[PDB]
């Protein structure tokens, strides 16, 4: 299973009637390119080291699409304002997700192409890739025009072709380790909580990618009630952290065990509290 995505955003400003436009391309959930209009000199840029080798003719081409999209978002942003009847005098947000999922047979599983306006789903291309699903009374307008104009056929092309083909190039030239996985280094701190009780907190750190699972056990029986945790968080060096905690009576901490599950681990980790 591999995948490609371009995540596009445009936010319309009051007065200065250029919106900020931002686009970021992911390969297997890794940022590999970026375009940000607000930047002093706009241009798609490489955002992982393995992209540098694409010649200049690639970056210009790419960059013109961006300026293309910038405009389409400029205009679509207006069009919408009319549908919803809102003020030229307030900030509005429109986003797009597009790309392909491949399966480990490098066959095409699914292509996506959808949009959000003001943080609510607006229109999405269905899995058939010939029809639209539309929320608002307003996004039906966008739908009819798209059905009439043959919008779907265009996107289907991108999806079943370029997006597949280029995701392969990026995935053979991205041989240069997109493989990177840094395994977690886990440990259990100990924190007295109440009279007769303590918290044991299992930490997973310095791991990449961000998927990981933590569990706590009491003599083989996984814990689900009384498990506190946090959402996975960037350490700020490209890796992630997470922890999970349970409360446990004083003196019995050594027969609770923490398990950590991550790809790039040879086996699943097992640990308990010990100074």
């Amino acid at each position: 299973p591999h995948s490609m995505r371009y995540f596009e955003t445009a936010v319309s400003r009051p007065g200065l009637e250029e919106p900020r436009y931002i686009s970021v391309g992911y390969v297997d959930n890794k940022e590999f390119v970026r375009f940000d209009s607000d930047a002093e000199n706009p241009r798609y840029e490489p955002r992982a080291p393995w992209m540098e080798q694409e010649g200049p003719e690639y970056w210009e081409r790419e960059t013109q699409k961006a300026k293309g999209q910038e405009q389409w978002f400029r205009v679509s942003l207006r069009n919408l304002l009319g549908y919803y009847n809102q003020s030229a005098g307030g900030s509005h947000t429109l986003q797009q997700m597009s790309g392909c999922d491949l399966g480990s047979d490098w066959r095409l599983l699914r292509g996506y192409l959808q949009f959000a306006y003001e943080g609510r789903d607006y229109i999405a291309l269905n899995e058939d890739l010939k029809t639209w699903t539309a929320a608002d009374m307003a996004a039906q307008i966008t739908r009819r025009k798209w059905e009439q104009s043959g919008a779907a056929e265009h996107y289907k092309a991108y999806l079943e072709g370029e997006c597949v083909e280029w995701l392969h190039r990026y995935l053979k030239n991205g041989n240069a380790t997109l493989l990177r996985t840094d395994s977690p280094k886990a440990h259990v701190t100990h924190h007295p909580r109440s009279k007769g009780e303590v918290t044991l907190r299992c930490w997973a750190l310095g791991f990449y990618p961000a998927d990981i699972t933590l569990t706590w056990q009491l003599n083989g029986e996984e814990l689900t009630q009384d498990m506190e945790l946090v959402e996975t968080r960037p350490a700020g060096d490209g890796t992630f952290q997470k922890w999970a905690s349970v409360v446990v009576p004083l003196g019995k901490e050594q027969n609770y065990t923490c398990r950590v599950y991550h790809e790039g681990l040879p086996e699943p980790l097992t640990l308990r509290w010990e100074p």
């Binding site: 371009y6 686009s23 790419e62 679509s76 069009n79 919408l80 790309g99 798209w146 991108y158 997006c163």
Partner: peptide
């Protein structure tokens, strides 16, 4: 390579 949109909304 990124998609380029067709008809606007």
């Amino acid at each position: 390579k990124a998609v380029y949109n067709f008809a606007t909304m």
